[PDB]
Amino acid sequence: GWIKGVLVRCMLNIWGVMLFIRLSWIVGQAGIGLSVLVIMMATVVTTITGLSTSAIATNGFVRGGGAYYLISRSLGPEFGGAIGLIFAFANAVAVAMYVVGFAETVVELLKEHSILMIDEINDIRIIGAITVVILLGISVAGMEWEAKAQIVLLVILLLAIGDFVIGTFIPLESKKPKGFFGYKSEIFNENFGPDFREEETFFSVFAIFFPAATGILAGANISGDLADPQSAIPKGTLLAILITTLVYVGIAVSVGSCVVRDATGNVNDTIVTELTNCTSAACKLNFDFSSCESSPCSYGLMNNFQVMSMVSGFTPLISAGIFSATLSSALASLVSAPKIFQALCKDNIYPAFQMFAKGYGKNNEPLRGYILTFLIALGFILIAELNVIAPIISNFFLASYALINFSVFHASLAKSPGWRPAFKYYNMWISLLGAILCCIVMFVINWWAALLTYVIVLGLYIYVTYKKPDVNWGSSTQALTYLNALQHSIRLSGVEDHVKNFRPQCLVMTGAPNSRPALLHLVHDFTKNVGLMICGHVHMGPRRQAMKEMSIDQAKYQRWLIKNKMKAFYAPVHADDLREGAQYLMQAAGLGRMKPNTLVLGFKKDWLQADMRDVDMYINLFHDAFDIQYGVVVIRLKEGLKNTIDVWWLFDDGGLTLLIPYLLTTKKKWKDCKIRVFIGGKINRIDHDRRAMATLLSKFRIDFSDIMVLGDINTKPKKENIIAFEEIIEPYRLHEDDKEQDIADKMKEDEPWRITDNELELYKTKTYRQIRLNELLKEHSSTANIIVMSLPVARKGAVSSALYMAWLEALSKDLPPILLVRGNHQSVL
Amino acid sequence: WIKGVLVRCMLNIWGVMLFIRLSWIVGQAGIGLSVLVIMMATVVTTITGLSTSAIATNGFVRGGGAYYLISRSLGPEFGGAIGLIFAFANAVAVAMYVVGFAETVVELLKEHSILMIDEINDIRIIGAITVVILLGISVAGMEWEAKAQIVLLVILLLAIGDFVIGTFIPLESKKPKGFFGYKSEIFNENFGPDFREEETFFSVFAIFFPAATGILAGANISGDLADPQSAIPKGTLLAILITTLVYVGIAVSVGSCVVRDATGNVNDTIVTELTNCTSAACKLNFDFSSCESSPCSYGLMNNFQVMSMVSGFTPLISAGIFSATLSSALASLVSAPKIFQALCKDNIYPAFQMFAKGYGKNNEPLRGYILTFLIALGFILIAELNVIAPIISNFFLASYALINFSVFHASLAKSPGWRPAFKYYNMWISLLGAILCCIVMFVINWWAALLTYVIVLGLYIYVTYKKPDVNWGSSTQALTYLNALQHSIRLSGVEDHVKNFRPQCLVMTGAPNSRPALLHLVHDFTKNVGLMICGHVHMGPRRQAMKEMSIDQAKYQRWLIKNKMKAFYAPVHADDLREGAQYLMQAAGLGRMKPNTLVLGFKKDWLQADMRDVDMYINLFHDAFDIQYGVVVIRLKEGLKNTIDVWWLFDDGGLTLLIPYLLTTKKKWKDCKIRVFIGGKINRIDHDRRAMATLLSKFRIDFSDIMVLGDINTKPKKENIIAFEEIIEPYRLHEDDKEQDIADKMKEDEPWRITDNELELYKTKTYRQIRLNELLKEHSSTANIIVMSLPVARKGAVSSALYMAWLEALSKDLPPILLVRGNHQSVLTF
């Protein structure tokens, strides 16, 4: 069955080098009891990882054939990328262990057949060379043949285990010079002793052993897609762990009972009565032990690593059994690691490794990953000591396992996704303790490599927390990000005080985001990572086809706006005219705390050639903005496209107009600019005004250059400027005094935005003032980047729309990019 | 200014070990190794000081306290962790310095005639007495600290100057001990390391570290200066510099006077003749007897207070020792409990809220005092200062590494509240310092470092989710606020295409406090799959609208936070209900987080209600349909086996099925047992059965049963029909029964009247909408939630009264009933 397929592949993954190659040395180095405790602790850590993989696998939705795919969809890329990289590296380097064990077994065979190879130590590497160069071909070719031969090759392992357990119980005379005795309880008593260690310790042998009981993840998740892969696989993996554990415990007990720790291949040593001091622990026979305290026995349990091969019955078959085991485990590792690495490369988490996504094979099967794994595997083959290779393999596998356990616990604690484990056996604390014990056992063994590994993990944490990925949650798992944003906004709704932070938000009413790009850039400069600005577009069109064009325009403008990286959300509405859409955006747009409070408008430079009722619409838009207590911002900027950023604070307004330049300075674009504040005041009072204004300026900490308090206000500008203003308002001046009263009343009633004569004499001083400030701006702030000035206003209906726009024309007439502002009454800080 | 922080750092750093253990350190590690230890500890301290200066510069000019400075700069997590670790570290540092005082006193008593007990017990008793006297003084001692600090620094500098003068002054009587006049050969001999008693370089570094610690108290103890932003760095770092200089200005100097092995007796004096002199001692006059064989009385290895012996007129250096010990004791003992009280105040850790209260002449945490004094007096149990030091060294290293890594995390993550505003600061350098601190901790007392790592990991795990989800505790909203901002871009920047349909509903109920049952029920299936926007329209004068508008917003936000709903209360002002609903449905939401369906609690008791209200209510349905929203209504009874009856009768895009599926995936409705009713005429049952089965398999409902009814579209019982006719009787326009003129001017009098022609036209529709009521009554008498496809009609074709009466008849007297209709776009989208 499919569960039988997962179980057979997990049997194949777990049963590698240490089924027979090294387990003799472990059982002889510490003892039967200590070895069994090693098996138990390795089973504990492996089963904690199995529970974590069950928890991630049993998520509601199932997709993807890769292990990295499942770990990345189930939990965010923050841990997913690190787990993928670490496990890919570990699985790539496990090939080294498996093939070097293969080569050592071949060497053991060839020592008896061939008298001596030219370079025995390097013979392991020269054999590993042919093994890897043929294993790459086996991995890239005949995948279906390998899948069909899975069962055939694992039958070899089952036959080998049966062979050895058949051999161990029965006594035999064929292996008489060597250490072969059958289940003698004296052997158990004399081998249970922990005090067998030679240059190695308990945790060292645990570290060397650990590769045997690891690899469950590759069996579970490399397949990814099969019959019922979401729920039924984890039960197969837990049963896999149980079966492998029982096999290892039983085989360890049998080996410890059978073989003596030190056996010399000699016919002698058979003493009729050696009850005196019983130099041999098996004092009854003593066939094979003598003078091995001085000259150690060659064929002993701890001395001979492959004693189980020769001492078991029908020894030719067992060698082929290990051969199949190691080649199978190596090929599984060599096919599993590169695909994980390619999945990680396809994810844009690590652009430095982006070049590895090649897919040279027609049916995927990446080749560059194979080449990289080839290189690293051979480089690790360059070590001929398996007892030395094992600590690194255990190091990286333990790193990956601890990272998996901690990531699963993190998902359980911080519930951002739909992280609902369907396996009741999972518990967050159990996985946490598993991760802690994994980290501790990591520290204990080969501490320097452990510290290097923690440094690497912390470096990946740095790299991910800075460069955030955009592949997986961007496609088919945007729900994770949606829940992220929703939970963060709900958290935001928790805050209860608003007085501390004014925190400007800019609802920008540009016609379209692509239109007036300079305006968008400028407004984004002083509102970026300090507040959200919303590009509001009041769409015009028929009702029937409204929503479709809404959607298409929203998509197009959002793509354009993210291309020219902005922090803006395109919010379109439908309304009969601009004012209604503005009302919609002002009163309803925004959620909880992220609600716009300042209304940004581009100056209507084409008001002269446009219908005034739309300009009247514009001024009514200003007045509606003031009613809801918004801060009005107007930008006039020459669309046809380094010293200072001048400020012209005149009226108290609010704290917003002095706040705008500050945020401009910190963006590194206006960093090399100096704020030259201008504030009006009395001629007798500049010094007092200078100190009084410097107090507030220091409070705003905008590091003012100076405060050129001036008294040129309330002055007739000149003959020509008033002439120009008269020319500006001439097409709309209403000559009631010159014309008949009846016709003047008719013109007023049919059309109300005329500038009545009384309006001119009522507001003559205001017009003089506005022209005065215009000419002062021309004289002083001509060579400045971004002028800031308090926005002139008037009571609703007290001033006609035409004259109000005339004032805004006069003030911002010939200046560089200017930024008129009038905030609300409340102070910003 | 300078005197505010430079003096405090001078008097803090130069604690007890400079005056006793530094000479022993030079004994264990050679002059080169001693200087290497000095520079390494100085690098740690300088990196910590630079990080502290960056913290001070960031955020704002002034803060309530160092705890609050760190809290503003980063937030609750790192600030609370640093505060707790540093408070514990100062609590045990009090123990260190008082043990130093105790050992000096007991050594003096050894010099003195009488002895009370053996050495370890004398330390215990005298240290306890001094700790309780320090209790008496320290509880109220802020008035004289400003005057006392300068005098104590003067005394300490007098002691240091006395040592310097005594270094160049030899004397023949004291020459048997390690007392010589700046001889070069002894300096050469002392250059080489001599590590004895199984003491090693990093172990000596471990003991030494607390001597070069205490800079953080420069800003922690008090600000209150003319320029707190500028005064804190320029002092503290400066202090560190001279500290190291004085340390090295002592270190090599020590090696210039004192021999590594000496004995007091003058008898063992070599005769001036050609002798072997393996040791440099008999170079001058003194053979000794190779004191490595037998433990000698003095010689920088057995007389710790050797610096007291060298300086002429040793009472002054002894008094300097007293001054340094007491000064560092007061500094740390005032620093720690204030931090602990601040941690209680910020409410990051609810388990310790009982310790916030304080009282006295000025409110101070006497509880925090008593607990720190108790635990410190517990730590006095170990009377060996060499044993004491490594634990405090580990805590200081943990605190400094945590501070440096906190600065790095603020700088790297582009923290919204972070701004370096410092001339010479590099986040990479802070990382390097913190990392080296981590390895150094792991090197010394590996189990203790493991314990600290476990504690900090547990605190991090506690403060990641358990605290913030309920209440993070920080008073600076910005560090949260701005964060959410970018996440919204993360939601808007992702191209969702069309495969991102989720239930995002706004519940158009004016008063959230009223009708909480509907809010809880809709939040039940909107808890973790979408946003709930309890929109609220307000009608009133524009003059006072805004103020009361915000008042209502705040009050109802408090109410929704008091209960457990994940809902944003976004209210608007409008002329009437329809305009406000239009405002919400057109502009509410930002990015892709926009409402998609319009929950409307049924207008129960509409009988007494005016007809204009009902007209606007039905026009809300029509507007929602026009603007491509899903309409869901609910008739929960306001008084507020197990099965949820889903009557999928009209293909609405799967919403009618999706909603109960969301209900099931929750704790409350785990026992759901959905029963799916379908409508179909007489035909093969298998067609409908398998079609509905595969449709449910698509959306993963996992039906308990699928059942089909053929009794729809049949004539209902006569009593029910006449009951409905009497229901619609007050609004019925019997135009046929009455005269034509009356009906006419009544119709142009009120457009909502229902002509009998409407009843004739939709007689079969009313028959369906009442027969379905009878069927759901007899079949589904008991049911948790009855989710039913919502009837629809042409806009304006039927008078709103008749449409609303249809909706009322379909839910006449029922358990929780939930009518649903959606846009035909959620085709297996979820």
Ligand SMILES: NS(=O)(=O)c1cc(C(=O)O)c(NCc2ccco2)cc1Cl
């Ligand atoms: N600043 S303006 O008067 O020239 C202006 C101008 C426009 C504009 O029409 O471009 C605009 N958008 C409304 C719109 C209609 C159709 C598409 O967008 C808003 C404004 Cl404030």
Ligand SMILES: NS(=O)(=O)c1cc(C(=O)O)c(NCc2ccco2)cc1Cl
């Ligand atoms: N769900 S409902 O039709 O019965 C309804 C019910 C209410 C309601 O709570 O009365 C409501 N609030 C309007 C309001 C008036 C004053 C303040 O808010 C709106 C609606 Cl749509």
